[PDB]
Amino acid sequence: RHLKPFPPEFLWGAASAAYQVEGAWNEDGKGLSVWDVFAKQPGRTFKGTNGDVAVDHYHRYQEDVALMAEMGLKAYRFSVSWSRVFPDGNGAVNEKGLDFYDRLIEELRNHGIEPIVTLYHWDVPQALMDAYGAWESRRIIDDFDRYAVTLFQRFGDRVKYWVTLNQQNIFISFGYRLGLHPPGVKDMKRMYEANHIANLANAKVIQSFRHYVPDGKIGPSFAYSPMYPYDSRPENVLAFENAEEFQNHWWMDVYAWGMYPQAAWNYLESQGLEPTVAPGDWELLQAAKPDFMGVNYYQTTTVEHNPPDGVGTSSGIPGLFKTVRNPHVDTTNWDWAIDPVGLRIGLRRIANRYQLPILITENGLGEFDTLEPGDIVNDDYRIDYLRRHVQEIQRAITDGVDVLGYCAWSFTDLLSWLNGYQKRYGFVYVNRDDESEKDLRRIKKKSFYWYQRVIETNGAEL
Amino acid sequence: RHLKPFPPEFLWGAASAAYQVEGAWNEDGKGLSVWDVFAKQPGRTFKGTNGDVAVDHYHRYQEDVALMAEMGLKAYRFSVSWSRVFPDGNGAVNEKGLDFYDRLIEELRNHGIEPIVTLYHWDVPQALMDAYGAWESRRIIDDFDRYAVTLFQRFGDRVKYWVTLNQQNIFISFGYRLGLHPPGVKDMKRMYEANHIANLANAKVIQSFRHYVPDGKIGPSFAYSPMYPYDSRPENVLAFENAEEFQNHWWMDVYAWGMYPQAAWNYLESQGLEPTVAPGDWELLQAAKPDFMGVNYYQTTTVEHNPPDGVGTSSGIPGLFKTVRNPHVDTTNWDWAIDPVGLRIGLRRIANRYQLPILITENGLGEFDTLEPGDIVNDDYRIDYLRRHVQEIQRAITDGVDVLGYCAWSFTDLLSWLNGYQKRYGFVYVNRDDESEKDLRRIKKKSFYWYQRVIETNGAEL
């Protein structure tokens, strides 16, 4: 079987998120985000780590882009911090905030790197939470649209690729069901209402994008764990049907088709959990087709039958499914599956169901890297993980999936939302830890040079 | 979770096919079908059994309909023999042939039974095979359309529910890949060409139906074996992705969306097997949406990884998948799997992928039946099989699938295409065998009274 090459304009990328890298949390007129406030609540984050400084990319962006150019990155995906642009979410635009992203975009373009702008990575301005509960109010649809249009107007001439909501399923479920992320709520009814409003906000911004960036490409990015049945027991295959629909189609069908899947809807309706639908909602959701599906991928999930008095280790929904360890894949040191074939499966499923091109917006390995004498980081484990995923992407392309690019997570080490700094993801080590910022110096890991060679050969040497 | 009831207008049905029941193979001007000719080839059918007489429904239809009314059937699904209506396939209409179906439809309507007319059950007139190779020629599109339009014009005022091609995947694959059915060809290239022509014929007649029967409901019926992965090994899940797309989406995506799935298309193209596409084909296929998906269901299929030098007992496609026995399902005395949950899974998959209502056009158990003195046939095994499938349909309805009805296969015993009469499917035993027509008398089996009670309670008592 001859494999197809990676296409000539394949976006070999790397990625970050604003709160995780920028720092400068109160500089240049930036307003408070919900994460600025949440992470300072005692006990919320490991060792009290927060984004006040992070890795200081706000001040060190020129050095970081110089490293990207040394690597030969074709694309860099970053998020814009809404609270830098509209400190209060709505109201007056902050020109100094826009100017940072203008300088970053110019730095990228001057080095031949395609910017991929992510509108939203979980950091809605605290003022919108204070005023109306942020994602629980339809008011956010127009406020988010005004913010997005501002970015489209300022940067649409120079940015072709845009991501709207990044991992909506995570920020909504962690914020409103698990209570782990802002606003720290544990209420499924509120979760599904906020989720519906986020769906409308995504659709509204895509419609606006067609007016302001007619030659651009836009899509949401979904945190996709493809589901597997444990085996060929009919009840386990049925559990897989339930899980793939409830965990995955629930989001991606809205993004692609503007419709929630019916079995999941009817289940929520039987629990009194389905969202409130207003006139015009379906019309808007259906009339906002994206150019691609963004995919954040780390692992698959295997499921089995879960009786109605069952699991609510394993997690699941009684009567629908429960998770079970997959005996046929390796695991990371944090019990995450390592399943590169699962990435090919997920790509195939998206092409098969929606016929959409895919931008892989995030994939990477987190591990406790050691800085050895001479400023050397031997992260062969990260090379092995990335190599295997890139190989499976090439097989998915050969199968016929249109993959637009691959953004490794992450370019530099960064702050995790709740777990501090020690589990590192970067190609570039940042010298700091949970106790202090040290000197924040950037140190290329072995994986940096491996990926440099991948890009130079367009994937022929992995 | 309590099960939902069956909807009040649920079509409790039973079904047959013209060649399998009618007889009267050369009466009232009927022309030869491809099956009249094929079954008379020596050695082709068990003990030389053929459709010359079958169970003589052509002459005994009044008694058979009287039995349906005694059972309280809500619907009877039958096929129309094209060669009775157009003995030469095209050319002159045969009024005596139409008159049989008119008399049958009047008998059904006089007893309050909904006719479900199936346009095609494998019996294209031999004259069209001789003239141009039947399904291998685009000429059949207009000839099939003129036949269908004739039926719509004569019967559309009295028939709401119509099935177009019944089990296209079977008549095409058995006729052109396995050589088991007419025309006895074993050539994948020819199979995919004939299949594409059948797709166009289906779409053309649905378009005609929208004009002639504006209040009717129409759809194709697909012989659906839902695929399962053997286990959660990523390569086996990938084999399942390949198999479901190649075996199932290849047909149902064309019916629902007018498009072949891309990974399967690209594989066939790499083998030189993809069909020839003419201008206008995609437009026609996309503009012929059905009201429902018909489903003929007997069993699921489990698959596993198949290396490129592998199977092509097990069957499959090297590099894509191969079948494997599922250790987690029962079997009939003929080694067909018994998997009622698989029916729920298939119904869920069709709703989840296509949002279509489903008419279950065929499901039943074939087994030897013993005629006991006093005209008693105790077929508790058939009751058990049907009960378990109906129970799973009720669960699919509860999940949110719109199931329009359920046609048990079959109403009376009938002639098998290749295997004679001994493996019986009816609610009504027919006293004949492979060697003799005996007296052709109809004898109600125990399952007849069971289904009568199902219908009386609208499925509440199973």
Ligand SMILES: O=P(O)(O)OC[C@H]1O[C@@H](O[C@H]2[C@H](O)[C@@H](O)[C@H](O)O[C@@H]2CO)[C@H](O)[C@@H](O)[C@@H]1O
């Ligand atoms: O008497 P048999 O051979 O058991 O035939 C029963 C009915 O078979 C249905 O089609 C089956 C077919 O027999 C299988 O070979 C194939 O794999 O499955 C299809 C699935 O529907 C026919 O629909 C019916 O006309 C026969 O009575």
Ligand SMILES: O=P(O)(O)OC[C@H]1O[C@@H](O)[C@H](O)[C@@H](O)[C@@H]1O
């Ligand atoms: O450090 P952790 O907890 O493994 O988190 C890693 C990543 O988890 C992903 O879900 C998020 O998209 C990233 O923002 C985050 O960096």
